[PDB]
């Protein structure tokens, strides 16, 4: 079974998700999943074709478990890991405002998403973060956007140039 919308990998993960009966275990699995399979910094591209869908299924389980485990106040203001959402947001924004260059900034924003994306952090705090973190990231990145030659930009990004044609 190798289909686009239905296949063995997806089926396997659905089973793996059904075995998360506790919030802490499920939340940890979701965060680990994001480090392993999301963003260009993912540990591996093995799940490239199904990670988006699998991640969503895992999010569903964490959300349901969080809602049942948390009182009303904590559901609104605490991350799935028990951290004060506001403190995390402010602390991350503080680090972003102290970022010295666009390289440190991208690491900050991307890492924030992999670790706190809902249902880990409440949506209100998370998107307020997207608002602030995204602003600084772009301000640093779009300054003198074309000055660095592609030859040098390839080196900064750290890609391995495999082939060039022109």
């Amino acid at each position: 079974k190798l289909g686009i919308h239905s296949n063995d990998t997806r089926d396997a993960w659905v089973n793996k998700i059904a075995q998360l009966n506790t919030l802490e275990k499920a939340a940890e699995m979701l965060k680990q999943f994001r480090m392993d399979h999301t963003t260009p910094f993912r540990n591996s591209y093995e799940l490239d074709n199904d990670y988006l869908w699998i991640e969503a299924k895992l999010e569903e389980k964490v959300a349901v478990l969080k809602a049942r485990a948390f009182n009303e106040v904590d559901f609104r203001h605490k991350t799935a890991f028990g951290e004060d959402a506001k403190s995390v947001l402010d602390g991350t924004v503080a680090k972003m405002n102290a970022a010295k260059d666009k390289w440190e900034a991208e690491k900050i924003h991307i890492g924030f998403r992999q670790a706190y994306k809902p249902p880990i952090m409440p949506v209100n705090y998370f998107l307020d973060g997207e608002r602030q973190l995204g602003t600084r990231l772009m301000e640093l990145r779009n300054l003198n956007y074309y000055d660095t030659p592609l030859e040098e930009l390839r080196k900064q990004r750290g890609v391995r140039v495999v082939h060039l044609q022109s």
Binding site: A56, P122, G134
Partner: protein, 388 residues
């Protein structure tokens, strides 16, 4: 110019014969129903559904999406164009919602246009019929111009609360409903100003400037908590569903209904004012139209979701508790307005009874749908403390 230089394939003999010669004997498929693959909510698929469902290019990783793969271009940082991360609510399919009124753009602007033209006819008839002669002066210059006028900012704020949803809604059917709920709110704010502008034209000395109503809204006491609630609902909520649900299924259903129906619609007639009720009729019709859509989305689709019913109700109960407090504060501060009325206008018993109607309607139409255990007398007693 009689015939023209542009030759059209449908009427030009030479071109038309070429076209016809290339045509097949019959259609290359007998299934002439666009959207045939959409699961109909009613007996047969509707034009509303066909023209709307699946317009949004969601991939399958956003519940109900038919596409596949990541978005082509995301935000700096990685945020998806649309994503599950923009709201706490979960569902088996974001495309299940259906506006019970089946409003796509054409029917929507058609009805609003009819209302605009009839409104113009009404005003010309009202002014020519000199009906303004019987309207109590103090009610007109004090309560309509200042207090009803300040309420436009409440509706304007609720309109603006919809901006983020217009961008983040996870489906076409929800985006269209959401946009129309918002557009009707700005319409009402504009109708309140329209009435003030009309009075300025037929009442010597009547100033249509928004300075007075705006100062009342921004610095008065009657609307202080209402404004604090509106500012929060609009700018402190980053979850498009929390916004739409809290606005329509909590704040506007309690505070909005009380102000529009139990205060102004209820007392205007008593002062010879058939003008304000004309516009409030539109606002209430709009409220009832939106209510159907709001109930379908939050109760029929999400609150009763076959997989996330329990979860979604927990979240909505959370939101109701979160916004019920600020809503009660808004009603409590609004109670101060009754002490401004001429003696004998109304009494504590009428006020209370009217609060219970609003609270009871809310329990029936909203709270009970998610098992929120509202205490009607506790809610009312809390509001009444605001009476002077």
């Amino acid at each position: 110019s009689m015939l023209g230089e542009r030759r059209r394939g449908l009427t030009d003999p030479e071109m038309a014969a070429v076209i016809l010669k290339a045509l097949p004997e019959a259609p290359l498929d007998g299934n002439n129903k666009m959207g045939y693959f959409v699961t109909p909510r009613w007996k047969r698929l509707t034009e509303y559904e066909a023209l709307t469902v699946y317009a949004q290019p969601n991939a399958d990783w956003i519940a109900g999406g038919l596409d596949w793969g990541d978005w082509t271009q995301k935000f700096h940082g990685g945020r998806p164009s649309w994503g599950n991360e923009t709201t706490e609510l979960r569902t088996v399919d974001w495309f299940k919602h259906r506006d019970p009124l089946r409003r796509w753009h054409a029917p929507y602007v058609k009805d609003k246009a009819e209302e605009w033209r009839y409104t113009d006819r009404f005003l010309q008839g009202y002014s020519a019929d000199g009906q303004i002669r019987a309207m109590n002066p103090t009610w007109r210059d004090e309560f309509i111009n200042r207090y009803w006028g300040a309420f436009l900012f409440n509706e304007y704020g609720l309109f603006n609360a919809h901006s983020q949803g217009a961008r983040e809604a996870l489906s076409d059917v929800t985006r269209v409903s959401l946009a129309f709920w918002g557009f009707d709110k700005i319409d009402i704010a504009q109708m309140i100003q329209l009435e003030r502008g009309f009075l300025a034209k037929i009442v010597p000395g009547f100033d249509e400037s928004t300075a007075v109503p705006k100062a009342e809204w921004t610095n008065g006491e009657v609307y202080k908590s209402a404004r604090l609630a509106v500012e929060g609902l609009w700018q402190e909520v980053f979850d498009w569903n929390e916004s739409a649900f809290s606005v329509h299924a909590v704040y506007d259903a309690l505070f909005g209904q009380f102000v529009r129906r139990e205060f102004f619609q209820r007392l205007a007639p008593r002062f010879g004012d058939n003008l304000t009720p004309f516009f409030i009729n539109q606002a209430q019709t709009y409220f009832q139209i939106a209510k159907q859509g709001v109930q379908d989305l939050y109760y029929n689709c999400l609150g009763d979701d076959p997989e996330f019913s329990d979860y979604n109700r927990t979240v909505m109960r959370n939101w109701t508790g979160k916004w019920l407090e600020p809503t009660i504060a808004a009603l409590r501060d609004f109670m101060g307005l009754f002490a401004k009325l001429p003696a004998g206008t109304t009494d504590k018993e009428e006020i209370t009874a009217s609060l219970y109607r609003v609270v009871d309607d809310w329990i029936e139409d909203y709270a009970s749908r998610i098992d929120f255990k509202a205490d009607r007398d506790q809610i009312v007693k809390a509001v009444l403390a605001g009476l002077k």
